[PDB]
């Protein structure tokens, strides 16, 4: 009995990849199908060895190795759309390795994933990663506040928001984390009680002056 | 009855390493798998000798041995991603051992771990250990206060933080202690209630808090 017959009737949600260390990797796509395919190998109706992989859990696994053997590295995400040839989105304006060191990094990442054939390393840009987060945060008309600093940016959304701006901020943030990850740009949706949605002015002698972003917010009498 | 079959069905979560003192080592990776593998060797269904090693309890054992024979040492962690060759993250700007004393330290650390072939002692910079702790703390929009002193730094997080901020602080402290350890940089989260919620106050150079229409409070700086 082969492994692709011991799973369900719909033989299109799991993809069986032959490994290089004489194993067999089942490639699910979410957390429900991962426990659906792990119960099969847990009850033990298979005589060889088999492992279940993912896209999230195989992305927190080879980042633990990477902040021990390659610290001070700038990167975004590893994409597993074609699971035999993954794409490693590396950052361009924050690293200094040459072409010879990138072949060593592409070989030591190939040795970590025995189901893969060759890891492709593409140097994505660094200003389009924040431009695609600000144009998408301005398209839903959400009150945001950008905080640029060295080696990452941060968008904060505060105030007494309503239910539409909460459902729209959750819907955009979860569609942005899936593409870029939370390594460079981070979102800060928090609910306080002030009718001004984050911004604050002080009034004296000429009009209003825009204050700098601080921790304290003025509560709303309204 | 070999040891790799006396454990569970999944032969992936454990890793059996042969030792040098004629003893087998089972390398778990958390406490639940440690008590799962120590129950097997404790109930007695294995004839020869075996031990259960861990990431943490081996890191707190060669730090008990280290501060008796090698005091006044500046180090961070021992990394066990490949257990037959651990990495010893030593400091660079805080100790002046030569190349011969680093080979003596790399042989006395190998003699404590009978499953290790060699120990890879790597020296590391001391500025990026605090820069990675401050640039990751500025990103999460947390109020903090750096206290630099000789031989360690200290970040103090104060205020009346809400529930989002006390969860973003705990996930960053827990994700930073795994890599660097609490030897150089120390975090300190203390939270307290805000005195000025419905009060009127003046801030700046001469600051005071009005606790009543007829009550002034002058806080000492």
């Amino acid at each position: 009995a082969e492994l692709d017959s011991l799973l369900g009737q719909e033989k299109e949600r799991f993809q069986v990849l032959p490994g290089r260390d004489k194993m067999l990797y089942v490639a699910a796509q979410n957390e429900r199908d991962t426990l659906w395919a792990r119960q099969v190998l847990a009850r033990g109706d298979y005589d060889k060895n088999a492992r279940v992989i993912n896209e999230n859990e195989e992305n927190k696994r080879i980042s633990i190795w990477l902040d021990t053997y390659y610290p001070q590295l700038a990167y975004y995400r590893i994409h597993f759309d074609e699971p035999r040839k993954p794409v490693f989105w590396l950052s361009r304006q924050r690293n200094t390795m040459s072409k010879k060191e990138l072949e060593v990094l592409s070989q030591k990442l190939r040795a970590l994933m025995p189901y893969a054939d060759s890891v492709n390393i593409t140097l994505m840009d660094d200003v389009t990663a924040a431009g695609q987060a600000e144009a998408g945060l301005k398209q839903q008309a959400l009150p945001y506040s950008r905080r640029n600093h060295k080696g990452g940016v941060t968008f904060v959304i505060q105030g007494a928001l309503d239910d539409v701006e909460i459902l729209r901020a959750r819907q955009f943030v979860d569609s942005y984390y899936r593409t870029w990850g939370g390594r460079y740009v981070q979102f800060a949706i928090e609910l306080k009680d002030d009718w001004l949605k984050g911004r604050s002015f002080q009034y004296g002698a000429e009009g209003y002056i825009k204050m700098s972003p601080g921790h304290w917010y003025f509560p709303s009498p309204l | 009855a070999e040891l790799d079959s006396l454990l569970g069905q999944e032969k992936e979560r454990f890793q059996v390493l042969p030792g040098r003192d004629k003893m087998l080592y089972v390398a778990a990776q958390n406490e639940r798998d440690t008590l799962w593998a120590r129950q097997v060797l404790a109930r007695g269904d294995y004839d020869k000798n075996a031990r259960v090693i861990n990431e943490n309890e081996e890191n707190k054992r060669i730090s008990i041995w280290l501060d008796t024979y090698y005091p006044q040492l500046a180090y961070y962690r021992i990394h066990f991603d490949e257990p037959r060759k651990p990495v010893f993250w030593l400091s660079r700007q805080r100790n002046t051992m030569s190349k011969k004393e680093l080979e003596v330290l790399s042989q006395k650390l190998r003699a404590l771990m009978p499953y290790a072939d060699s120990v890879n002692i790597t020296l590391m910079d001391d500025v990026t250990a605090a820069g990675q702790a401050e640039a990751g703390l500025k990103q999460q929009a947390l109020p903090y206060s750096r206290r630099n002193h000789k031989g360690g730094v200290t970040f103090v997080i104060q205020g009346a933080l809400d529930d989002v901020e006390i969860l973003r602080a705990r996930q960053f402290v827990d994700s930073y202690y795994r890599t660097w350890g609490g030897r150089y940089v120390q975090f300190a989260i203390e939270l307290k209630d805000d005195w000025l919620k419905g009060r009127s106050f003046q801030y700046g150079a001469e600051g005071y808090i009005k606790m009543s229409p007829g009550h002034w409070y002058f806080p000492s700086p």
Binding site: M211, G214, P221 | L196, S200, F201, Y203, G207, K210
Partner: peptide, 26 residues
């Protein structure tokens, strides 16, 4: 203890007698 970055007076429902004494130093 009083976290605001700048300089200014914050009045939360004062009564125009407590308020003008804050301007009585400037």
């Amino acid at each position: 203890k009083i976290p605001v970055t700048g300089s200014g007076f914050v009045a939360k429902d004062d009564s125009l007698r407590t308020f003008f004494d804050a301007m009585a130093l400037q």
